[PDB]
């Protein structure tokens, strides 16, 4: 418990959504950090070099989740609870379209320009992006689908289901390569590497899965019954980050030794880790967004290089 | 079909060529098929 996590004067000015922050994310380059929140749903982009917000864009409805397609801030896709998909170019709003049924989560396959919609239907919608035409559907044969993820290493698509079964599909030829069986539904699904996979459950269990073996390599159980929203992987220290509303748990990939735990004042909607840094970004049920720095986990980010001197 | 309840496949003009296919896959195609056959207990 000798980790001495610090909490943050103002690294970025006006890092403050009016009431709450729904989702926090970072770009591939690391130049831009994006956040969305209630009220008057906004998309606010903060430049790391300038330590200020680049722009703020109000939206019609609350955004469940968004994906940064471009390397920079130019191209963003928003999913709405009103079945609305909004595309944003560098200028601003570009186009808006509907999805036949409500969408829980979506993932984009960078090869072939196919974006997959997982929602309140048995079928998982596919939208080709080089040609605007909607592609042929794939039938998952499950009443409700919760989450989806795409493997970067070899392009494998897996969708979570309400029955608790993970079904793996192939983006090429659109056939079901395999299926996995494991009452609680799948809260979070994450791919790490070629061969490692993680399943989150609403009861509060983190199950690490190998693609080749049905049995889980390791299981970690949150004592609270709250579901875990986000599961993240940190390669350098082999630390797996599992986050729920009450607390954030960071533990080792092998043998399940716990690194440290952080409990904030308010519940977390989302958590984010800046690449190759000990800095942690959290979105809370508070106008402020929490910023935490762990010196042990990694060095300070380059744009915040003086933080190491300040400690 | 009302309010876009039923999916329609008309071409979308604004979405045309919105992105370019970019792929970084380390696994060769032969390795993928062998891995896919052996997934889980199969």
């Amino acid at each position: 418990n000798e980790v001495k996590i610090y909490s943050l004067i103002e690294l970025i000015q006006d890092f403050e959504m009016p009431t709450v922050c729904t989702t926090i994310k970072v770009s591939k380059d690391g130049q831009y950090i994006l956040a969305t929140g209630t009220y008057k749903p906004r998309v606010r982009c903060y430049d790391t070099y300038q330590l200020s917000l680049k722009f703020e864009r109000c939206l019609d409805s609350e955004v469940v989740t968004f994906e940064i397609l471009s390397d920079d801030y130019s191209k963003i896709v928003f999913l709405h609870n009103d079945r609305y998909i909004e595309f944003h170019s560098q200028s601003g709003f570009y186009y808006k379209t509907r999805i036949p049924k409500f969408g829980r989560d979506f993932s984009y396959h960078y090869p072939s320009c196919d974006l997959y919609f997982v929602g309140a239907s048995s079928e998982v919608y596919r939208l080709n992006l080089e040609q605007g035409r909607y592609l042929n559907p794939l039938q998952t044969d499950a009443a409700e689908n919760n989450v989806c993820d795409i493997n970067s290493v070899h392009g494998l698509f897996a969708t979570g289901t309400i029955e608790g079964r993970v079904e793996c599909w192939d983006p090429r030829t659109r056939n079901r390569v395999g299926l996995l069986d494991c009452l609680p539904t799948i809260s979070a699904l994450k791919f790490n590497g070629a061969l490692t996979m993680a399943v989150g459950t609403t009861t509060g269990q983190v199950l690490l899965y190998d693609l080749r073996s049905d049995k889980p390599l390791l299981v970690k159980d949150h004592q609270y019954g709250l579901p875990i929203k986000s599961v993240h992987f940190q390669d350098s220290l082999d630390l797996i980050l599992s986050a729920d509303s009450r607390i954030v748990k960071m533990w080792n990939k092998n043998s399940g030794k716990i690194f440290t735990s952080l409990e904030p004042e308010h519940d977390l909607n989302d958590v984010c880790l800046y690449p190759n840094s000990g800095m942690l970004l959290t979105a809370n049920e508070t106008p402020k967004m929490g910023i935490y720095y762990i010196p042990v986990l990694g060095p300070a980010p380059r744009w915040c290089s003086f933080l190491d001197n300040l400690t | 079909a009302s309010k876009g309840r039923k999916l329609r496949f008309h071409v979308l003009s604004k979405l045309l060529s919105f992105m370019a296919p970019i792929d970084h896959t380390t696994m060769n195609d032969d390795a993928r098929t062998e891995l896919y056959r052996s997934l889980f207990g199969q």
């Binding site: 035409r133 592609l135 042929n136 559907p137 090429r172 030829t173 | 079909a1 039923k6 999916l7 329609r8 496949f9 008309h10």
Partner: peptide, 11 residues
């Protein structure tokens, strides 16, 4: 015609 699903071929 508007509801007929397109068929794609593997390249």
């Amino acid at each position: 015609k508007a509801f007929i699903p397109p068929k794609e071929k593997p390249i």
